[model samples]
Target: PIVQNLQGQMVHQCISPDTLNAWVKVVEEKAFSPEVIPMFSALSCGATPQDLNTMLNTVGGHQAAMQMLKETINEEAAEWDRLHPVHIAPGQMREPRGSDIAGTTSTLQEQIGWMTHNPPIPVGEIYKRWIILGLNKIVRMYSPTSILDIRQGPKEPFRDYVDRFYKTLRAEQASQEVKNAATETLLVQNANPDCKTILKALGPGATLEEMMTACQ
Candidate 1:
């Protein structure tokens, strides 16, 4: 019951002293914090001996020990419960014990199956908290379609527009094939009528370099 207070409230409700001991052992093997034992002792606060002993020694070595540990554990458990809430639906599917990811399949396979199998998240569902503390000059280019959003300004010359287009293209992480195809389509669609006519004359068979040369 020492580990039970926090364990009951934790996501990993299925925990034992042995399991935590194993975790601590592994943590030590990796040359982890020197305060692991001290921290873990505090973690096992509810039914701790020192607290009980303190109460016992003070209270004539008996009586009120029940409420002493119980209240402290309850307080810690309440705090833990507040921080962590149950969100994922409880699964009734049972498998072998000591398994991490469920099912007999590999962890990756099971996890991948989970992602593809689950339905899309609903909008305004409060699925997870998302926060942007402050916004600055953080530009995120999601897809190559951003190029299509670019259009030649009415007064912008073909030469300058092409230069600007390629400048924006440089920031994109699209592959050579994607860049070639995007530039081929974008050049014609986004260009001035005169420039578009010249590019169209090159035909679809014209390579990217050929189109660039004709544009110049």
Candidate 2:
């Protein structure tokens, strides 16, 4: 049912490869249009080789496209950091504060430990966008087709493969959330049950002594 609901939504909203291709074509045309040339020309007045390289590498050539690309990269980078933040181990010697090199080294060490100990979880939204972009690139490599074959492996239905991939990710995410909630509830219940009984058992206005006595 969950898969079905997602599939239905995917279909209704037209989020398949075909729809993605359509959207990409629209964006590409709009970005590279003649009207956008003037803006790039204006900005090119003070642009150096380094600036051009930065624009091409991080952002696209077109000013508007470059802006969008930079923003998207920043957003994805932030999300990746959020989902896979570096966490230092307890009992480790504290490094000196305000040392960028030391801090970076520690962070990198923690990140290496994390990647080794805990496998990274792929961000589905980001992955999907990547797949869509890859597909568009392939389609554009040859003559653009309404029905693009973006198959990665051997002969298989593209739609079915995409659906299965997304379904698996969604299921895993749901399971993880459910497990986390259940674990948290159990911990809360076991750690702090019947507060009134605990307080009363301490004794009438006994303070810390009452607590010790109650424990005894």
Candidate 3:
């Protein structure tokens, strides 16, 4: 069976006669020499051809065909691949025959949904091979609490509250002024709602110590 498969593959690889009918116009123009075409025909390595019936027949060359066809040949070869797709080998997979582009893109977007561990990449072009590469993890903003989650309630001591607040801010490498600003803001929001009147009377520029005194 192994030998039989190899035989079939080898036979399948043999040149197709149709290719010559296509290649002849170039030959008629005396276009290609062996130097231009490097792929030698497996059967023609030691001989010539029956078609074209020409003395310069190559065995089976032209491995690198169409690489430089752009700027050297017509522009149609470049666009034809875009306009029409030929079958890819079994190693690669194509969408099902009945499926359309919109369906395939919806499928890709669905695949991206289950990856909840990381920030999702935006899905846009599904036609190309540009897979959503990396995730941008969100660093959740530090709590807006005056408590630092350490301890906070109206019953909590004002000094301990301010002290814990300042400690957490310093851990974030916050500047002294920034520490003052955040401490005041958090106190205004978290302090007992009854403290609201005194806080406004103290004004926006009120210091951390003043907010603590009002809460007390």
Candidate 4:
């Protein structure tokens, strides 16, 4: 087994009182070893606190061991948060512009990864918080109105613009009913004047399926 993965797994398993004491003894025995230093370095990202390593040697009982593990992990996550801060405000949750799709997706994933791996948070509450705050902002963008804002290009062909619109709408996380409604709304919103006239001639409240069939 790879030493880094092995030690990383061991470090992760130290949340409980039993594993906390188990890791304490192992680290205490190999406190000065070359391999053990990487364990701390992984958490601190190279500035391995030698004093904390030394402090582990004197730690006794489950309470102190669990406390140390919590303290160190929380500190590491705080430093991580500082470097890669990802916060999505309620107002910023609208559909990303075409150019921003990839970047916004990665930003969502970054915060989810941080929230999932940060050990200090209890498992019971993590899911709830992630859904409320993490998913709340990102997924809210796929709604009908925001999807309408994608807009057709000035010189873009009707077929080409429809293709782009479908491509964008398909990426949304909404239900089929929502997507169908948004598709019709966006087509009407972005249609050329001639297409709009044709739609107007076809009578009011025509569906996208009817509009496309008539245009073809």
Best by lDDT: 4
The lDDT per prediction is: 0.41, 0.33, 0.36, 0.43
lDDT of 1 by residue, 1-216 (tens): 122244443111223556455444543452212233334334333322222223223323213332443444444434434665433236622221211121112243333333223361111111000100000001112123356666777677666787667655644434568667766687679887767888988877787668667867
What candidate 3 gets wrong by more than 4 Å, as runs, is 1-151
Worst 10 residues of 2 by lDDT: 95-104
Query: What would you estimate as the lDDT of candidate 3?
Result: 0.36
Model 4, span 87-206: residue lDDT tens: 346533332221121122234333323323435222212222221232223323323444556655666566776776665565454567876776456577777776666766787667
Cα deviation in Å at residue 148, candidate 2? 20
In Å, residue 144's CA in model 1 sits off its true spot by 14
lDDT of 2 by residue, 1-216 (tens): 001244343111112354334434443665443233334333333232222222234433345444453454445445555665543457653321211111222343332232223242212223234323332332233332212222223343333433443333332333556433422232222222343245454534344334333433
Alpha-carbon RMSD to native, per candidate:
20.8, 25.9, 28.3, 20.7
Give stretches of model 2 more than 4 Å off: 1-55, 58-60, 87-216
Colliding residue pairs in candidate 2: none
TM-score of 4: 0.31
Native-to-model Cα distance after best TM-score fit, residue 83 in candidate 4, in Å: 34
Q: Candidate 3 clashing pairs?
A: 39-61, 41-60
